[PDB]
Amino acid sequence: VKSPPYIFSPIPFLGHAIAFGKSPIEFLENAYEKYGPVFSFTMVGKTFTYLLGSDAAALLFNSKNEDLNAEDVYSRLTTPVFGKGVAYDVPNPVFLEQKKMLKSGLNIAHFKQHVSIIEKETKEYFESWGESGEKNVFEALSELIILTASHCLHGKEIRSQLNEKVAQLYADLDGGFSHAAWLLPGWLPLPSFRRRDRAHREIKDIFYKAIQKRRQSQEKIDDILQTLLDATYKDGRPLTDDEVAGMLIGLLLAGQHTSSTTSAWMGFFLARDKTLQKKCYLEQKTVCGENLPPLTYDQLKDLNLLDRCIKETLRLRPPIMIMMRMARTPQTVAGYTIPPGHQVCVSPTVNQRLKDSWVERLDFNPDRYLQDNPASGEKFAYVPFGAGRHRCIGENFAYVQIKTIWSTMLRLYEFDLIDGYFPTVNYTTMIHTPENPVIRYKRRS
């Protein structure tokens, strides 16, 4: 019995909070060099054990939630935002159920409907960018995705009510996943704490009556909202209007931030690699034809390069940069015993660019998958949607949304860096944001 290498720190309480805050990826890779796949360090009077590489990460992915707990760590931030009796508020077994329900709502039939829906929103949104210029993609994209994710995941009724004042109510809920909300106790009245709660009431308010306007009209609609309203536990019990509104919040935020960032990033990887951009456009005409008809689900599958570009964006810029659990009981990896109390973490970012396995690691090269790579050679080197019990459910949908949008976009414009500036990464927010994401765009010929 031996516990992980511990990284001592001179600072009394902060610990590594400043160095890790600067560049977490730099911090963690160096730590990998000095100490290996398994190490501990303290930050803000908290101890963290990291697991790097596929083998060590296996601990986290394979374990049972009674052993590595996700509520113990996520709940602080989630419950105030999403709502009571949903996500990390309920026992895991109850949550597995809520997932199985949502998952059902993400099936080919619904995606088929989504493609055109998304393609419309994209075309219409960009009517105000005209023929050329230099604008903020990340800003645009997150505005559009809030629109597309809404139409798809919240149905027509709710989407038609998305104005500026609702956009703000969501933006107030973004300010819940913060530095301060994780450490400080929920009785210190920071401005954000207050707004996060205000918007939660105001938005559940909107969902409350929008639910029932569908709970009534006999107009048979087959969408995500419908699925939820019709679904049922092993109990037989249906979801209360509270539960339903709850998981509507989860759906919008999860499905909105993770796609915007990714989409936004791919824009720059594509504008930087101009030939790779043109082969993406060429692939569009090959798979869809010169006339370029509207898009259908069936065409997406044959957009292989585009798929590998998305797979490559997610490799280098995974929206979920870290994943965490509380050790409720002692766990063993690489001969080390992690003591109950440590917060265990894995970083897809580190794993997916690790030197031992990713050849030309910092290169944006979608052709890497047409070779030998750890994404197939190994179980947990490529993990942008996680693995095991806490596995993502949105991957199908996320690919649908990003695929359609970028297809449509490559059809509308050609994109270039401004003076050859490729955005750097900001860590001020959990949200993996690109520095100064303004892009040059001219009409496609």
Ligand X SMILES: Clc1ccc(CO[C@@H](Cn2ccnc2)c2ccc(Cl)cc2Cl)cc1
Ligand Y SMILES: OC[C@H]1O[C@@H]2O[C@H]3[C@H](O)[C@@H](O)[C@@H](O[C@H]4[C@H](O)[C@@H](O)[C@@H](O[C@H]5[C@H](O)[C@@H](O)[C@@H](O[C@H]6[C@H](O)[C@@H](O)[C@@H](O[C@H]7[C@H](O)[C@@H](O)[C@@H](O[C@H]8[C@H](O)[C@@H](O)[C@@H](O[C@H]1[C@H](O)[C@H]2O)O[C@@H]8CO)O[C@@H]7CO)O[C@@H]6CO)O[C@@H]5CO)O[C@@H]4CO)O[C@@H]3CO
Of 1, 8, 218, 290, the residue at the interface with ligand Y (CB under 6 A) is 8
Q: Could you say which of 385, 412, 417, 431 contacts ligand HEM (CB under 6 A)?
A: 385
Would you say 7 or 149 has its CB closer to ligand HEM? 149
Is the sign of the CA dihedral 432, 434, 437, 440 positive or negative? negative
* 254 scored as a contact of ligand X (CB under 6 A): yes
Partner from ligand X, ligand Y, its own copies, none contacting 258, C-beta within 5 to 8 A by type: ligand X
Residue 288 assigned as binding residue: no
Integer Cα distance of 425 and 296 in angstroms: 34
> Cβ distance 240 to 84 under 8 Å?
no
Calpha distance 434→319 (Å, rounded)? 11
First to last CA, the chain: 66
Element containing residue 415 per DSSP (H, E)? strand 413-416
347's contact among ligand X, ligand HEM, its own copies, none, with CB below 5 to 8 A by partner kind, is: none
> CA gyration radius for the chain?
22
State the Cα torsion 236-237-241-244 to the nearest 10°: -50
Using CA atoms, how far apart are residues 44 and 9, in angstroms rounded to an integer?
11
Q: Which residues in 15-44 contact its own copies (CB under 8 A)?
A: 18-19, 22
Determine the residue with CB nearest ligand HEM: 394
How many C-beta atoms surround the C-beta of residue 163 within 10 A?
9
Question: Count H helices, E strands: the chain?
Answer: 18, 11
Q: Which of ligand Y, ligand HEM, ligand X, none does residue 78 bind (CB under 5 to 8 Å by kind)?
A: ligand X
Residue that the structure tokens 């030939």 belong to: 275
Least CB distance to ligand Y at residue 200 (A): 32
Considering only residues 3, 92, 113, 373, which one is a binding residue for ligand Y as defined by CB under 6 A? 3
Binding mask 159-178 for ligand Y (x = CB under 6 A): --------------------
Site stretch for ligand Y (CB under 6 A), options 8-16, 66-74, 82-90, 406-414 = 8-16
Question: Among ligand X, ligand HEM, ligand Y, none, what does residue 77 contact (CB within 5–8 Å per kind)?
Answer: ligand X
Segment lying near ligand HEM (by CB under 6 A), choices 253-261, 285-293, 337-345, 410-418: 253-261
**Nearest-angstrom CA–CA distance, 205 and 209:** 7
Question: What are the DSSP E strand ranges found in 2-84?
Answer: 6-7, 38-43, 46-51, 68-69
Q: How many residues bind its own copies (CB under 8 A)?
A: 7
Q: Which of 148, 262, 331, 349 touches ligand HEM by CB under 6 A?
A: 262
Shortest Cβ distance from residue 240 to ligand HEM (Å)? 19
> What is the number of alpha carbons within 13 Å of residue 393 lying toward its C-beta?
18
320: Cα within 13 Å, side-chain hemisphere? 19
19 binds, among ligand Y, its own copies, ligand X, none (CB under 5 to 8 A by kind): its own copies
| Nearer Cβ to ligand X (53/176) | 176
Q: How far is the CB of 14 from its own copies (least distance, A)?
A: 12
Enumerate binding residues for its own copies (CB under 8 A): 10, 18-19, 22, 426, 428, 435
Binding annotation for heme: 392
